[PDB]
């Protein structure tokens, strides 16, 4: 947050930091999706991978919950993606 | 003398600038962080295959390659962290070369996957040296053109000697 | 007779597979060297002596916790200067025949290896050769059948639990370099799968994970991996560069004045590699 | 029996206060330490240890090393081991410790202004001239003597930030090490073990990755990356009564320690120097 | 290339 603030005392700096993190994350997520597009998804998730995902999500949620913090079309689409609401369009 | 070494430094900068477009590679995003991978040179490997690559040395003259950088205006007495950064850079270069030599075979299978050609024994070393030289160019960009005619620094020279001894021994160990 | 009809008795059992090695030449008496540890009912199915002799590995315990849980772990006996085949801590099914000198050791141990490693062709070859070698019928046949039955009993004890662990959801293990940004890790999980069920159990008992996520808490035992796995098998190699110095102080004045009774850090190199996950304690 | 127990040269100049000074015996050991084990533990969260290097027949190179006393949850100040002069006053609760200890810390970090402030404050103690000034003289002289002893400039190729792969550039941990006092530098050398040891073109690696971190804040029991390393630690009562009189017990235990492993030590043509 | 050298 301080490194980003170097570029200014932006009003929504916390939201901005979260957005930048999630955007850098989505870049590599698009990379993975491109790598896997050709492959065929299954009707249901791989159970082992699903367990790993749940277990790691536990820790991720714990950390980001412990750290409490403080022009609409594309903005809201991307924000919905950030919040993982896959109903985004 | 060390003036010739300054000439060497300028020449390596200009010659890197030259070949990075004579052969249009500039894989300039990479560094010495760890062992390089063919995944970042696939096309560069294809272009390399267009030339016979046996005109390369098994060993690396880590000494002469890095000594020119040691010539800088350390007398400014403002950034000794610059000298410490140089020490870090040289040590990490030595580690990079040592790991490349130790796992040279592993890279050989990597580049067997990527462009399975007889010249791979030289392509591995060419990738190593070219990524290293891109890192050298980036380091030159980072530092300032404060090269003096002559400058003594016993500590840096000693670090160079001791690390490069390991580097040369490792490269020599590449038997065949 | 004294005992109740049948009524399988209960006693201790030597657990290391190699304890069953005996000279097929009945006229030649032989005793295998077994460490007493073999008689501990634990996950180890190899005694310390055989482990060190054949795999270059030594057992070790890692306290874990409030309630101090003890996690089994093995450690390197590999020196710093060992190279090539010497670095194969546990050979794969495609290399054990070479790493282990079948010619130099006893036929019974060769059969044991061809059983552990799923080499049915070699097992059958040995069985037929023993059928047509020496006084097979008299006692050599019974000795061979006893050794084979013991090995098969151990393997049948291990493999079902190993498969259940493989498909298990609550307990998950991943033998690879947790530093995914590395090249010496590879498809460590695939190689572990290639290994036999009993071999997989041994690997689990020996190699501790770099990290361990219990429910919601994660413990990082290392910021690095002390061993790797490739096609050759379990390799005592540093994934990133120079080998770790292994003094091997045992087995195969002012300084002390200051350094009288004084806590000393061991120079041993334990086995840390991969990721492990568990729900609840299950202990 | 020279007592090098720095932080035990503390006298409760206040009459109502008595300083027990219950600190470790090893201070009477003529070692490279200038602070014995209990002071080290209390004020730096370090436990003294020794790491043998060559121990075959009589070559007994036993490099010293201390251990983290920081779990895998502490952060920032809680994790800093040896704070820099810029932040030690904040990391240490100087106000919560005796003024003599504060003076010792200020001398160690060369906070002469704080030293002057402390003696000025002591000026206004009831028995100031009688014995407070004597205590000041004793403590100050002892601390100054220790500091001069540590400082090598008074009357070798160990690099601490030169191990860090993946670092962008710069190092500078050795810069801050230089900025430290002679006592602090000697403490760092004595407690922190270089991850690599090169002797006359012969490199030994002790860890596959350094355990400590050095930055502007000082010495930190942090990791170069990723999460922190796991680092765990009569009045007869009713509960103390035990019930009726009536599992790798047979195997040794590998310590769950986090020794200070960081840096590269380079040794020139000199052989296995054992003096 | 092992002979062209
Ligand atoms: Zn045994």
DSSP codes joined into one string, C69-119? EEEEEEEE---SS--GGGGEEEE-TTTHHHHTTTTTS-HHHHHHHHHHTT-
Residue of C nearest to B92 (CA): C241
Give the span between the Cα atoms of C223 and B80, in whole angstroms. Answer: 30
Contact D39, D7 (CB under 8 A): yes
The C-alpha of A48 sits at a distance from chain C's nearest C-alpha, in angstroms, of 6
CA distances from D61 to C243, D47, D57 (A): 20, 20, 11
Give the span between the Cα atoms of D264 and D169, in whole angstroms. Answer: 17
Residue of D nearest to C283 (CA): D247
The strands making up C228-230's β-sheet, listed across from edge to edge, are C88-91, C233-235, C228-230
Query: At C271, which helix (H) or strand (E)?
Result: none
Contact C177, C239 (CB under 8 A): yes
Any residues with CB less than 8 A from the CB of D9 and at least 6 apart, and which?
D100, D104, D138, D139, D142, D143
Of C53, C93, C88, residue with least CA distance to C235: C88
CA distances from A2 to A17, B49, D160, D187, D208 (A): 9, 47, 28, 33, 32
* Number of alpha carbons in the 13 Å side-chain half-sphere of residue C125: 9
How many helical (H) and strand (E) elements, i.e. helices and strands, does chain B have?
7, 0
Mutation test of the interface with chain C: which of B35, B109, B165, choosing the one with the most C Cβ atoms within 10 A?
Answer: B35
The C-alpha of B117 sits at a distance from chain E's nearest C-alpha, in angstroms, of 10
Give D18-21 contacts, CB < 8 A, sequence gap 24+.
D19/D98
Instruction: Give D40-86 as a 3 state SS string.
Output: HHHHHCEEEEEEEEEECCCCEEEEEEEEECCCCCCCHHHCEEEECCC
Mutation test of the interface with chain E: which of B49, B51, B53, B54, choosing the one with the most E Cβ atoms within 10 A?
Answer: B54
Give the span between the Cα atoms of C94 and A82, in whole angstroms. Answer: 47
**What's the sign of the alpha-carbon dihedral B46, B50, B56, B60?**
negative
- Breaks in chain C listed by the residue before each, with C–N > 2.5 Å: 65, 252
Indicate yes or no: CB of C263 within 8 angstroms of CB of D47. Answer: yes
Any residues with CB less than 8 A from the CB of C134 and at least 6 apart, and which?
C24, C25, C140
Residue of B nearest to D175 (CA): B81
A62 to chain C, any CB pair closer than 8 A? The answer is yes
Give the residues across from C220 on adjacent strands: C211, D229
Query: At C192, which helix (H) or strand (E)?
Result: helix C188-194
Contact B70, B86 (CB under 8 A): yes
C183 closest CB neighbour out of B35, B95, B102: B35
DSSP letter at B49?
Answer: H
Query: At A8, which helix (H) or strand (E)?
Result: none
Of D144, D97, D102, D142, residue with least CA distance to D120: D102
Maximum distance among all alpha carbons in chain D? 69
Looking at beta carbons, which residues of chain D come within 8 Å of B165?
201
Mutation test of the interface with chain A: which of C216, C220, C276, choosing the one with the most A Cβ atoms within 10 A?
Answer: C216
Looking at beta carbons, which residues of chain C come within 8 Å of D48?
262-263
Indicate yes or no: CB of C245 within 8 angstroms of CB of D56. Answer: no
Regarding beta strands C57-64 and D196-199, do their DSSP bridges make them parallel or antiparallel, or are they unpaired? unpaired
Whole-number Å distance, alpha carbon C105 to ligand 1 midpoint, is: 16
Give the residues across from C277 on adjacent strands: C172, C213
Count interface pairs B-C at CB distance under 8 A.
18
The C-alpha of D225 sits at a distance from chain B's nearest C-alpha, in angstroms, of 14
Whole-number Å distance, alpha carbon C150 to ligand 1 midpoint, is: 14
Give chain B's contact residues with C (Cβ, < 8 Å).
34-35, 37, 95, 98-99, 102-103, 106, 110
The C-alpha of D35 sits at a distance from chain C's nearest C-alpha, in angstroms, of 13
Give the residues across from D193 on adjacent strands: D261
Regarding beta strands D196-199 and D264-267, do their DSSP bridges make them parallel or antiparallel, or are they unpaired? parallel
DSSP letter at C136?
Answer: I
Contact C229, C273 (CB under 8 A): yes
**Does E have 3 or more CB contacts under 8 Å with C?**
no
Angle C119-C122-C125 (CA atoms, 0-180°, nearest 5)?
150
Which chains sit next to B, with 3 or more Cβ pairs under 8 A? C, D, E
Quick check: helix, strand or coil at residue B55? coil
Give the span between the Cα atoms of C277 and C212, in whole angstroms. Answer: 6
Contact D212, D219 (CB under 8 A): yes
- Residue environment code for C124-144, b if the CB has 16+ CB neighbours within 10 A, otherwise e: eebbeebeeebebeeebbebb
Residue of B nearest to D199 (CA): B162
Query: At C224, which helix (H) or strand (E)?
Result: none
Instruction: Give C39-70 as a 3 state SS string.
Output: HCCCCCCCCHHHHHHHHCEEEEEEEECCCCEE
Contact C147, C189 (CB under 8 A): no
Of D89, D83, D46, D55, residue with least CA distance to D190: D46
Give the span between the Cα atoms of C83 and C100, in whole angstroms. Answer: 16
**Does A have 3 or more CB contacts under 8 Å with E?**
no
Whole-number Å distance, alpha carbon C72 to ligand 1 midpoint, is: 18
Looking at beta carbons, which residues of chain B come within 8 Å of C183?
34-35, 37, 103, 106, 110
Count interface pairs C-D at CB distance under 8 A.
134
**Does C have 3 or more CB contacts under 8 Å with D?**
yes
Give the span between the Cα atoms of D151 and D139, in whole angstroms. Answer: 18
Whole-number Å distance, alpha carbon C95 to ligand 1 midpoint, is: 23
Q: What are phi and psi of C101, to 5 degrees?
A: -85, 85
Give the span between the Cα atoms of D66 and B94, in whole angstroms. Answer: 29
DSSP letter at D214?
Answer: E
Give the span between the Cα atoms of C86 and D98, in whole angstroms. Answer: 59
Q: What are phi and psi of C158, to 5 degrees?
A: -80, -50
Of D113, D100, D110, residue with least CA distance to D140: D100
Whole-number Å distance, alpha carbon C18 to ligand 1 midpoint, is: 6
Contact B126, B100 (CB under 8 A): no
Q: Report the interhelical angle of B154-172 vs B80-102 (nearest 10°).
A: 10
Quick check: helix, strand or coil at residue C229? strand
Whole-number Å distance, alpha carbon C13 to ligand 1 midpoint, is: 11
Q: How many other C-beta atoms lie within 10 A of the C-beta of residue B56?
A: 13
**What's the sign of the alpha-carbon dihedral B99, B103, B109, B115?**
positive
Contact B140, B71 (CB under 8 A): no
Instruction: Determine the straight-line distance between the first and last CA of chain E, rounded to whole angstroms.
Output: 8
The C-alpha of C280 sits at a distance from chain A's nearest C-alpha, in angstroms, of 12
Indicate yes or no: CB of C254 within 8 angstroms of CB of D209. Answer: no
Indicate yes or no: CB of D205 within 8 angstroms of CB of C245. Answer: yes
DSSP letter at D249?
Answer: T
Give the span between the Cα atoms of C273 and C211, in whole angstroms. Answer: 8
Give chain D's contact residues with B (Cβ, < 8 Å).
157, 159, 161-167, 169-172, 174-175, 178, 198, 201, 203, 264, 266, 268
Of C37, C64, C61, residue with least CA distance to C48: C37
Give the span between the Cα atoms of D132 and C92, in whole angstroms. Answer: 75
Regarding beta strands D213-215 and D218-220, do their DSSP bridges make them parallel or antiparallel, or are they unpaired? antiparallel
Of B4, B155, B147, residue with least CA distance to B75: B147
Give the span between the Cα atoms of C251 and C271, in whole angstroms. Answer: 19
Indicate yes or no: CB of B106 within 8 angstroms of CB of C183. Answer: yes
Size of chain E in residues: 5
Q: What is the dihedral of CA A40, A42, A43, A48, to 10 degrees?
A: -160
Angle C134-C140-C146 (CA atoms, 0-180°, nearest 5)?
155
Whole-number Å distance, alpha carbon C84 to ligand 1 midpoint, is: 27
Any residues with CB less than 8 A from the CB of C91 and at least 6 apart, and which?
C98, C99, C100, C232, C233
A52 to chain C, any CB pair closer than 8 A? The answer is yes
Any residues with CB less than 8 A from the CB of C145 and at least 6 apart, and which?
none
Quick check: helix, strand or coil at residue C208? strand
Any residues with CB less than 8 A from the CB of B33 and at least 6 apart, and which?
D165, D166
Query: At D215, which helix (H) or strand (E)?
Result: strand D213-215
Give the span between the Cα atoms of D60 and D49, in whole angstroms. Answer: 15
Of C177, C173, C276, residue with least CA distance to C226: C177
Of D105, D143, D24, residue with least CA distance to D135: D143
Give the span between the Cα atoms of C253 and D50, in whole angstroms. Answer: 15
Contact C197, C159 (CB under 8 A): yes
Whole-number Å distance, alpha carbon C155 to ligand 1 midpoint, is: 16
Indicate yes or no: CB of C240 within 8 angstroms of CB of B106. Answer: no
The strands making up C275-278's β-sheet, listed across from edge to edge, are C172-174, C275-278, C211-214, C217-220
Which chains sit next to E, with 3 or more Cβ pairs under 8 A? B
DSSP letter at D8?
Answer: S
Contact C212, C218 (CB under 8 A): yes
Maximum distance among all alpha carbons in chain C? 71
The C-alpha of C173 sits at a distance from chain A's nearest C-alpha, in angstroms, of 10
Contact D103, D79 (CB under 8 A): no
Q: What are phi and psi of C203, to 5 degrees?
A: -60, -45
Give the span between the Cα atoms of D26 and D52, in whole angstroms. Answer: 19
Of C5, C6, C12, C16, residue with least CA distance to C205: C16
CB within 8 Å of chain C, chain A residues 25-44: none
Q: How many other C-beta atoms lie within 10 A of the C-beta of residue D66?
A: 27
Quick check: helix, strand or coil at residue C218? strand
Give the span between the Cα atoms of D262 and D214, in whole angstroms. Answer: 9
Query: At D143, which helix (H) or strand (E)?
Result: helix D133-150
Which of left, alpha, beta for D170 (phi over 0: left; psi -120 to 50: alpha)?
Answer: left
Contact D167, D207 (CB under 8 A): no
Mutation test of the interface with chain D: which of C178, C206, C263, C269, choosing the one with the most D Cβ atoms within 10 A?
Answer: C263
* Number of alpha carbons in the 13 Å side-chain half-sphere of residue C206: 31
Quick one: C159 exposed, middle or buried, by C-beta within 10 A (0-12, 13-18, 19+)? middle
**Structure-determination approach:** cryo-EM
Residue of D nearest to B89 (CA): D169
Give the span between the Cα atoms of D259 and B11, in whole angstroms. Answer: 46
* Number of alpha carbons in the 13 Å side-chain half-sphere of residue C128: 6
Residue of C nearest to A63 (CA): C216
Give the span between the Cα atoms of D83 and D77, in whole angstroms. Answer: 8
Contact C117, C54 (CB under 8 A): no
The C-alpha of B125 sits at a distance from chain D's nearest C-alpha, in angstroms, of 21
Quick check: helix, strand or coil at residue D5? coil
Tell me the structure's resolution in angstroms, rounded to a single decimal.
Answer: 4.1
């Amino acid at each position: 947050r301080e490194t980003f603030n170097v570029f200014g005392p932006f009003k929504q700096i916390d939201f901005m930091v979260m957005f930048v993190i999630k955007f850098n994350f989505l870049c590599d997520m698009r990379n993975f999706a491109k790598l896997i597009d050709e492959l065929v998804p299954n009707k249901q998730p791989n159970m082992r991978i699903h367990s790993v995902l749940v277990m790691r999500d536990k820790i991720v949620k714990l950390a980001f919950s412990n750290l409490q913090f403080q022009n609409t079309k594309h903005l809201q689409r991307l924000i919905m993606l950030m919040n993982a609401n896959y109903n985004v369009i | 003398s060390k003036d010739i070494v300054n000439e060497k430094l300028q020449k390596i900068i200009v010659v890197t600038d030259g070949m990075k477009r004579l052969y249009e590679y500039c894989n300039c995003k990479n560094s010495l962080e760890t062992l390089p991978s063919a995944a970042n040179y696939g096309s560069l490997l294809k272009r390399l295959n267009l030339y016979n690559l046996d005109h390369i040395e098994m060993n690396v003259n880590f000494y002469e390659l890095l000594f020119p950088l040691t010539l800088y205006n350390d007398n400014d007495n403002s950034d000794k962290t610059l000298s410490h950064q140089l020490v870090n850079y040289i040590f990490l270069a030595s580690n990079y070369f040592q790991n490349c030599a130790k796992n040279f075979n592993y890279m050989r299978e990597t580049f067997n996957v990527f462009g399975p050609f007889k010249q791979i024994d030289f392509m591995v070393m060419f990738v190593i040296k070219f990524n290293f030289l891109c890192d050298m160019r980036n380091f030159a960009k980072l530092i300032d053109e404060l090269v003096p005619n002559k400058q003594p620094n016993m500590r840096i020279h000693s670090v160079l000697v001791m690390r490069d001894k390991i580097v040369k021994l490792a490269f020599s160990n590449l038997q065949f | 007779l004294v005992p109740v009809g049948m009524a399988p008795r209960q006693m201790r059992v030597n657990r290391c597979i190699f304890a069953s090695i005996v000279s097929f030449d009945a006229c030649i008496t032989y005793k295998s060297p077994c460490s007493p540890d073999a008689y501990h009912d634990d996950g180890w199915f190899i005694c310390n002596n055989h482990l060190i002799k054949r795999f270059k590995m030594s057992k070790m315990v890692l306290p874990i916790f409030d309630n101090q849980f003890k996690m089994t772990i093995a450690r390197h006996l590999v020196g710093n200067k060992e190279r090539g085949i010497k670095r194969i801590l546990i050979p794969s099914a495609t290399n054990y025949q070479d790493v282990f000198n079948l010619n130099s050791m006893m036929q019974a141990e060769q059969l044991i290896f061809h059983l552990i490693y799923n080499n049915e062709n070699a097992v059958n070859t040995i069985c037929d050769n023993l059928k047509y070698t020496e006084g097979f019928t008299s006692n050599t046949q019974r000795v061979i059948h006893s050794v084979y039955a013991t090995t098969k009993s151990i393997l049948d004890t291990t493999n079902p639990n190993t498969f259940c662990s493989r498909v298990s959801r609550d307990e998950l293990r991943f033998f690879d370099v947790t530093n995914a940004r590395a090249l010496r890790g590879g498809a460590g999980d695939q190689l572990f799968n290639n290994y036999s069920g009993f071999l997989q159990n041994l690997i689990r008992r020996a190699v501790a994970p770099e990290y361990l996520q219990i429910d919601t808490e994660e413990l990082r035992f290392r910021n690095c991996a002390t061993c790797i796995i490739d096609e050759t098998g379990l390799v005592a190699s540093v994934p990133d560069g120079p080998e770790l110095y292994n003094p091997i102080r045992s087995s195969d004045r002012e300084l002390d004045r200051t350094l009288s009774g004084y806590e000393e850090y061991p120079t041993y190199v334990p086995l840390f590699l991969g990721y492990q996950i568990i729900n609840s304690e299950n202990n």
